[PDB]
Design a binder for this molecule. Structure first.
Ligand SMILES: O=C(O)c1cccnc1
Ligand code: NA
Lengths: 5, 331
C-alpha cells in the first residue's frame, strides 16, 4: 500500500 | 435588525491586499508527487475525515507521516493544501513535504516530515512550570505567524500540538479546519472541539476572527496550570456555555450579548441563571500551586474573555510578563 502492499 | 458586525483588531485586511490566488483555494492547482515513493507502515490514528499512517520514503529511507483526506465537501482538500503551502516555513508550523493519491481509491494524501507521535496532551500533565511557559510561547509563535498570514486555525487543542520533548521542538498540526480571515465574513460556528469552543461559537455569532484561537489557547492553559482536564467540561454545546458562566460570571456574558445584539437561543434560557465571577485563585490547590503564579492568573484572565475583541492578540500575549524569563533565556 503507494509501494506494495 | 441583526447582530452587530465585527472586525479583527489585527491583520484585518491582509487577505484583501493579497493577490486573489493566495486565498482562492478552490482555484488551486495541486502539484502531485509520486505515491510510489512511499510505503505505508502502520496506522497512527483516525480523524472523522482522515486516516493517519506512519510511512517510509523509500527514495531516501526517511520516515514520514501520511494523512489520507476524505472530507465530504471536496473543497476542504484544496483548502488544507493551500493553507499548508502558504504557511510552509513559518515558525512551529508542520511542514507539508508532498501530496500524493492512493493508487487504488485515488484519495488525496498529505505527506508530512516526521514528528514523533507524542502530542501535548500526553505530556503536559508531567511538565514543570518553566516548560509550560516555554511551550505556550512556542504555540504563540505559530499562532501569531498564521494570524499574520491571514489564517485562523480554529481547532487549537492539545491533541493538535505535537512535541518532541527531547529536542524541545513543537509543531502545530491538523489544519483541516483552518480558514482565511476576510472582513465581514460570516463563518460556520460548528467548528472546534466542544471543550475549546469560544463563546462566539456557543451563542452562534458568526463574524468571528483570529481571536477564536486565543480563547482555545486560554482553555489549554487553564487546564495545565490548574491540572483540570478539560477546564470547561460541558455535556453538550448548551451546557458548555453554562460551565463557562459559572467561572467568568454571567454579567459579562450578558454585556457581551447586549453589545453585539446577539439572539440567545431559547435552549439557554432555563439553564444559565445568574453567576458571580469566580476569582482565579479559587482553582488553586496543593497539587497545582507550583504551576500557578500572579503572572499566570493575570495572563489567563486576559485570554478568557467573552468579548472576542477584548482578548489578547497572539502578539500582545507574547509581551506578557508571564513569558519574561522565557524571553530572556531565549536570547
Ligand atoms: O497536520 C496533521 O494532521 C498531522 C501532521 C503530523 C502528524 N499527524 C497529523
Ligand atoms: Na478541494
Amino acid at each position: 500500500a503507494x509501494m506494495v502492499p | 435588525s441583526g447582530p452587530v458586525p465585527s472586525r479583527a483588531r489585527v491583520y484585518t485586511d491582509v487577505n484583501t491586499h493579497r493577490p486573489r490566488e493566495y486565498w482562492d483555494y478552490e482555484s488551486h492547482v495541486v502539484e502531485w508527487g509520486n505515491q510510489d515513493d512511499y510505503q505505508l507502515v502502520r496506522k497512527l490514528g483516525r480523524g472523522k475525515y482522515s486516516e493517519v499512517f506512519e510511512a517510509i520514503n523509500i527514495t531516501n529511507n526517511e520516515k514520514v507521516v501520511v494523512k489520507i483526506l476524505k472530507p465530504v465537501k471536496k473543497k476542504k482538500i484544496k483548502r488544507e493544501i493551500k493553507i499548508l503551502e502558504n504557511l510552509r516555513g513559518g515558525p512551529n508550523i508542520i511542514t507539508l513535504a508532498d501530496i500524493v493519491k492512493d493508487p487504488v481509491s485515488r484519495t488525496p494524501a498529505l505527506v508530512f516530515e516526521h514528528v514523533n507521535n507524542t502530542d501535548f496532551k500526553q505530556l503536559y500533565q508531567t511538565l514543570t512550570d518553566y516548560d509550560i511557559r516555554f511551550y505556550m510561547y512556542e504555540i504563540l509563535k505559530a499562532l501569531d505567524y498564521c494570524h499574520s498570514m491571514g489564517i485562523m486555525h480554529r481547532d487549537v487543542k492539545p491533541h493538535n500540538v505535537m512535541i518532541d520533548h527531547e529536542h524541545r521542538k513543537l509543531r502545530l498540526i491538523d489544519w483541516g479546519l483552518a480558514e482565511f480571515y476576510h472582513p465581514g465574513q460570516e463563518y460556520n460556528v460548528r467548528v472546534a472541539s466542544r471543550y475549546f469552543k469560544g463563546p462566539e461559537l456557543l451563542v452562534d455569532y458568526q463574524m468571528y476572527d483570529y481571536s477564536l484561537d486565543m480563547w482555545s489557547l486560554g482553555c489549554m492553559l487553564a487546564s495545565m496550570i490548574f491540572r483540570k482536564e478539560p477546564f470547561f467540561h460541558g455535556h453538550d454545546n448548551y451546557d458548555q456555555l453554562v460551565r463557562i458562566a459559572k467561572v467568568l460570571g454571567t454579567e459579562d456574558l450578558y454585556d457581551y450579548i447586549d453589545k453585539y445584539n446577539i439572539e440567545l437561543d431559547p435552549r439557554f434560557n432555563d439553564i444559565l441563571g445568574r453567576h458571580s465571577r469566580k476569582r482565579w485563585e479559587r482553582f488553586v490547590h496543593s497539587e497545582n500551586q507550583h504551576l500557578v503564579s500572579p503572572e499566570a492568573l493575570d495572563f489567563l484572565d486576559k485570554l478568557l474573555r467573552y468579548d472576542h475583541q477584548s482578548r489578547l492578540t497572539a502578539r500582545e500575549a507574547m509581551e506578557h510578563p508571564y513569558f519574561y524569563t522565557v524571553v530572556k533565556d531565549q536570547a
